[PDB]
Amino acid sequence: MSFIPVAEDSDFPIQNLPYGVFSTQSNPKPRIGVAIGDQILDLSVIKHLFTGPALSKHQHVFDETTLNNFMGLGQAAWKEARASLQNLLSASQARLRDDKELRQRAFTSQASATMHLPATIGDYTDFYSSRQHATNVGIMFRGKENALLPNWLHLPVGYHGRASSIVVSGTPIRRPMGQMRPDNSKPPVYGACRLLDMELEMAFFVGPGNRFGEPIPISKAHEHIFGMVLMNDWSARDIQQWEYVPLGPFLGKSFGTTISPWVVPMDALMPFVVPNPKQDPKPLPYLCHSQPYTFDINLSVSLKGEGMSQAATICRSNFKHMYWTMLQQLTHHSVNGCNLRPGDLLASGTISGSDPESFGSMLELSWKGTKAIDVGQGQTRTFLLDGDEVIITGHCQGDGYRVGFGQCAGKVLPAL
Amino acid sequence: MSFIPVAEDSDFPIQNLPYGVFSTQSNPKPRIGVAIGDQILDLSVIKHLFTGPALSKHQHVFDETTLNNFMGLGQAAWKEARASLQNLLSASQARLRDDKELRQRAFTSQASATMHLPATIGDYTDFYSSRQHATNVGIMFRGKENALLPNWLHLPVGYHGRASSIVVSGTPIRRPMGQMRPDNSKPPVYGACRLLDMELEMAFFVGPGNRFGEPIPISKAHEHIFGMVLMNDWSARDIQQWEYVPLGPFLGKSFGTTISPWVVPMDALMPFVVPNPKQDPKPLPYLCHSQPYTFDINLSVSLKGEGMSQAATICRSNFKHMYWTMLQQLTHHSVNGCNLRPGDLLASGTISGSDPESFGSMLELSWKGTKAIDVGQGQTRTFLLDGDEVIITGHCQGDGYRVGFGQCAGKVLPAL
Numbered sequence: 001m002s003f004i005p006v007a008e009d010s011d012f013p014i015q016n017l018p019y020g021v022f023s024t025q026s027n028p029k030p031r032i033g034v035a036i037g038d039q040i041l042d043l044s045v046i047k048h049l050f051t052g053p054a055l056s057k058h059q060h061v062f063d064e065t066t067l068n069n070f071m072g073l074g075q076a077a078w079k080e081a082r083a084s085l086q087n088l089l090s091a092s093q094a095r096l097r098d099d100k101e102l103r104q105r106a107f108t109s110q111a112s113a114t115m116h117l118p119a120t121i122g123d124y125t126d127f128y129s130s131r132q133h134a135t136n137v138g139i140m141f142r143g144k145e146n147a148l149l150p151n152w153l154h155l156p157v158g159y160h161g162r163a164s165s166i167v168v169s170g171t172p173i174r175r176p177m178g179q180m181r182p183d184n185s186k187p188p189v190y191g192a193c194r195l196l197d198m199e200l201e202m203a204f205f206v207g208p209g210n211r212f213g214e215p216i217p218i219s220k221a222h223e224h225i226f227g228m229v230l231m232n233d234w235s236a237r238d239i240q241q242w243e244y245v246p247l248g249p250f251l252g253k254s255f256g257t258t259i260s261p262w263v264v265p266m267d268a269l270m271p272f273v274v275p276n277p278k279q280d281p282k283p284l285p286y287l288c289h290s291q292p293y294t295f296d297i298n299l300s301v302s303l304k305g306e307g308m309s310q311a312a313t314i315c316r317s318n319f320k321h322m323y324w325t326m327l328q329q330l331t332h333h334s335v336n337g338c339n340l341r342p343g344d345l346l347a348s349g350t351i352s353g354s355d356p357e358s359f360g361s362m363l364e365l366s367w368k369g370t371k372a373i374d375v376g377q378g379q380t381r382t383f384l385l386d387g388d389e390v391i392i393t394g395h396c397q398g399d400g401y402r403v404g405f406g407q408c409a410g411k412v413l414p415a416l
Numbered sequence: 417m418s419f420i421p422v423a424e425d426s427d428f429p430i431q432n433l434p435y436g437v438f439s440t441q442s443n444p445k446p447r448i449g450v451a452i453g454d455q456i457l458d459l460s461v462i463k464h465l466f467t468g469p470a471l472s473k474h475q476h477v478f479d480e481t482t483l484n485n486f487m488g489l490g491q492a493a494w495k496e497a498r499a500s501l502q503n504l505l506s507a508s509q510a511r512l513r514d515d516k517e518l519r520q521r522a523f524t525s526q527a528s529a530t531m532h533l534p535a536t537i538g539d540y541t542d543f544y545s546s547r548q549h550a551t552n553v554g555i556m557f558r559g560k561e562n563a564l565l566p567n568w569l570h571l572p573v574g575y576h577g578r579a580s581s582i583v584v585s586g587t588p589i590r591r592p593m594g595q596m597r598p599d600n601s602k603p604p605v606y607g608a609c610r611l612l613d614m615e616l617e618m619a620f621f622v623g624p625g626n627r628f629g630e631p632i633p634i635s636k637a638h639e640h641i642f643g644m645v646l647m648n649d650w651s652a653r654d655i656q657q658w659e660y661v662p663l664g665p666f667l668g669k670s671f672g673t674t675i676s677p678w679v680v681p682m683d684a685l686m687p688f689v690v691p692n693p694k695q696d697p698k699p700l701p702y703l704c705h706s707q708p709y710t711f712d713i714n715l716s717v718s719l720k721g722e723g724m725s726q727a728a729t730i731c732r733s734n735f736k737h738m739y740w741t742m743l744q745q746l747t748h749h750s751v752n753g754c755n756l757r758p759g760d761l762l763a764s765g766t767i768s769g770s771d772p773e774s775f776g777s778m779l780e781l782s783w784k785g786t787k788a789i790d791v792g793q794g795q796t797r798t799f800l801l802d803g804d805e806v807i808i809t810g811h812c813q814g815d816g817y818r819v820g821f822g823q824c825a826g827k828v829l830p831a832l
C-alpha cells in the first residue's frame with residue numbers, strides 16, 4: 001500500500017493506478033494524472049521522477065494534454081511507468097513522500113478536479129461481441145429461429161462509430177430529433193426520439209499502431225491494448241430502426257456516447273483474468289490463440305428519474321460475458337491492413353449475461369417495451385424519460401481491495 | 417489572368433485556387449499552399465499579406481501543417497482569403513508580382529512537391545446518394561423489382577467510415593486479406609480478397625462545426641461546406657458481403673480510401689451549379705430547401721494494368737447525377753445533434769449516372785462479373801488485378817479555362 005491513505009472500498013488503491021486527463025480551477029490546462037485514494041497525482045509535475053530506460057528520454061509524454069503519446073510508447077514504457085509509480089507511492093519510499101514542496105504541487109483532490117476525455121480518439125469502433133445481447137436482439141426482431149445471423153459465430157462483427165460525439169462522464173445528453181417510421185403504410189415522420197436507450201459497454205484504448213497495410217497477428221495483439229474504460233452507447237432505437245438497413249447504425253448512435261475518464265491499465269486487470277468462453281465452431285486460425293484474455297469485472301447500472309429521491313439498480317452484469325475477446329477484436333480489425341492508431345477506442349458492444357438481471361439495455365430489460373422496468377418509488381420505465389440519469393459503475397474485487405472504474409454518467413435533456 | 421502563366425487545359429487557373437498541404441526536398445515541414453498554373457504559392461510565406469478584418473488576427477492558420485484551423489474560420493475568412501489571393505496573383509497587381517525576393521521564397525514547382533493529406537480528418541462519413549448506384553446494387557443482389565430499400569428515397573443513407581486509412585493520391589493499396597464465404601455450404605475461409613474494386617466518389621470537407629446537441633438547419637448548411645476532393649473508396653466485395661449484415665460495411669472498406677490532395681473551395685465551383693434533381697416523394701421539411709447546390713463536374717476513371725502502356729478510360733460520369741445534395745447530407749448528419757468538426761470528410765457514395773458508361777464501380781461496369789470490361793490492348797477485367805493502377809480525375813469546364821482536381825490515383829499491391 002501507499003503513503004496516501006486509501007479506504008477499503010476505494011476504486012483507486014495502489015493496485016489500480018489508472019490514467020486520466022484533468023484540470024482544476026487554478027490551472028485550467030488539461031494534464032495527465034493518476035488516481036490514488038481520493039487524490040490525483042499530477043504526472044506533469046512529477047515527470048522528472050521517471051528515470052528508467054524506457055521513459056527517461058520520453059518524459060514529455062507526461063506533459064501533454066492527452067494520453068495519446070504515452071499510449072503510443074508501448075508496453076515496456078507502460079510497465080516502467082507503473083513500476084515507477086508503485087515505488088514512488090509505496091509507504092516506505094521517501095522521494096515523493098518526503099519532498100514536501102513537490103508533494104504539495106503534485107497531489108490534488110479528485111473532488112475539486114474537472115475530468116476530460118483521456119485521449120484524442122482518431123477512430124471509434126463498436127463491436128457486438130456479447131452473445132446473449134446479440135441473441136436477445138435477434139429474438140426480438142427476427143424470432144428465436146433466426147436469433148443469430150450466419151456470420152456472428154465466425155467473426156467479431158462491428159461497425160465504425162462516430163468519434164466526435166464521444167463525451168466524458170457527466171455530460172448531459174439531449175434527446176435527439178430525427179426521422180422515424182412508426183407506421184409502415186405511411187411516409188416517415190420528423191420528431192423527437194421516442195425510444196431512447198442506454199447500452200452498457202466497456203472499451204479499450206489502442207497503444208502503438210500498426211503500419212497501414214500490415215496486420216497485427218493475434219499473438220502480438222496483447223502488446224497493443226493499453227487499458228479500459230466504461231461506456232454508455234446512447235441509442236435512439238426508433239431512429240436506428242428506420243435508417244440502418246443496409247449500411248448500419250448511424251444517427252441512432254451518433255448523438256452521444258459517454259465514457260468514464262479513468263483509464264485502467266491492462267496490467268491492473270490481469271489478476272482478474274478468467275478463461276475465454278469456448279467457441280464453437282472454432283474460429284479460423286488468424287483468430288485462434290490460447291492466451292486467457294477474458295476479465296471478471298463487475299458492472300452495475302442505475303437509473304434515477306427527476307423527482308425520485310434514490311437511484312434504482314436496473315442491471316447487474318459482468319464483462320466476462322463477451323464471446324469474442326479483445327485480442328480477437330483487435331486482430332480482426334487489422335487483418336485487412338487497417339491501421340489502428342494510439343488512442344483509438346474499440347468497444348465491446350452491449351454487455352448482457354444470460355440472467356435477465358444482467359441484460360445491458362432497456363430494450364432487453366423491458367423486452368421491446370412489453371415489460372415495465374421497476375425503478376422504485378412506484379415508478380416504472382420501458383425506455384428513458386427526459387430528466388432520467390443513468391450511471392454505470394464497475395470494479396474488480398480483490399481480497400481487501402478493488403480495482404474500480406469510477407463512473408460513467410449522463411442525464412437526458414429534453415429534445416430541442 | 418494571373419502573372420503566373422496558365423495553360424488553357426490546366427486544372428489550376430486563377431479561377432480555381434485550391435488549398436493543399438505539401439513539402440519539398442528542401443523543407444520537410446508540411447505547409448499550406450495554393451495551386452496556380454504548374455506552381456504552388458506557399459501561404460506561410462505570404463501570410464502577412466492577409467491584412468483584412470477576417471484574417472488579420474488569424475494569420476497563424478496559414479502556418480499550420482493542416483488546413484483544419486483555416487477550415488474552422490468560416491465563410492467570411494474563406495472569402496477574404498480568396499479575394500486576397502485573386503488580387504495578389506493578378507497579372508495587373510504589383511505587390512507579389514514585382515517582389516522578386518518574395519516570389520523566390522513564395523513559389524515552388526508542383527513537380528518538386530510532395531502532397532500530404534490536406535486535413536486531420538476527425539470523422540469520415542460515406543453517403544450512398546447516387547440513385548442509379550443503389551438501384552444497380554439492389555438489382556444485382558435482390559432482383560429487379562426490389563431495386564431500392566424502403567428508406568432510400570426518404571433520407572440520405574450513409575455510414576461512418578474509417579478515418580485512419582484515408583490516404584493521399586499515389587499511395588499504394590495492398591490487396592487485403594480477410595474472411596470470406598465463397599459459398600454457403602462450407603464454413604468461411606481466410607485468404608486474399610478475390611473481388612477487389614474501386615468506387616468513384618467526391619467528398620467535401622466541413623468548415624466551422626456545430627455545437628454538440630445543436631443541429632445545423634438546412635438554410636445554414638452551405639456555411640459549413642469548405643470545398644471538395646476526389647475519392648476512391650477501395651472495396652473488397654467478398655469480404656464486405658460476408659461481414660456487413662447487420663452493422664454495415666467494415667473491413668470491406670477500411671483497408672484504404674484514397675483522396676486527391678487539392679481542396680477546391682466551394683466558391684470556385686459555384687459558377688457550375690445546376691438545379692437539384694427533382695425528389696419524389698418530397699422529403700420532410702428539415703431536408704427541404706430551394707437553393708441550387710448540384711454541380712456540373714465531369715468525372716473520369718482510368719485503369720492501367722502493369723503490362724499496359726496506355727490507361728483505358730472505364731468510366732465517364734458527373735457529380736450532377738447525385739440525388740441527395742451536400743446540403744441535405746450535412747443537414748441530415750447533424751439533425752440528431754451530432755457535432756460535425758472542421759476537417760471532417762463527407763463523401764458522396766459511388767457516383768453512377770443512368771448511362772452504363774457512367775457506372776462508378778467495376779461491380780457495376782462488369783455487372784457482377786458477368787460482363788468483361790474492355791481495358792484495351794487485348795486485355796479485359798471484371799475486378800482489379802495486382803499491379804492495376806486506377807486514376808480518378810475531374811473538372812468543371814468554363815469558357816477558356818477549367819476548374820480541375822488533379823489526380824486521385826492508386827496502384828494495387830499483391831496480398832501478403
Ligand SMILES: C[As](C)(=O)[O-]
Binds near residue numbers: 137235350
Ligand atoms: C447494434 As444494437 C442491436 O446493440 O443498437
Ligand SMILES: C[As](C)(=O)[O-]
Binds near residue numbers: 656
Ligand atoms: C455500400 As457499396 C454496395 O457502394 O459497397
Ligand SMILES: [Ca+2]
Binds near residue numbers: 126199233350
Ligand atoms: Ca453499441
Ligand SMILES: [Ca+2]
Binds near residue numbers: 542649765766
Ligand atoms: Ca463507398
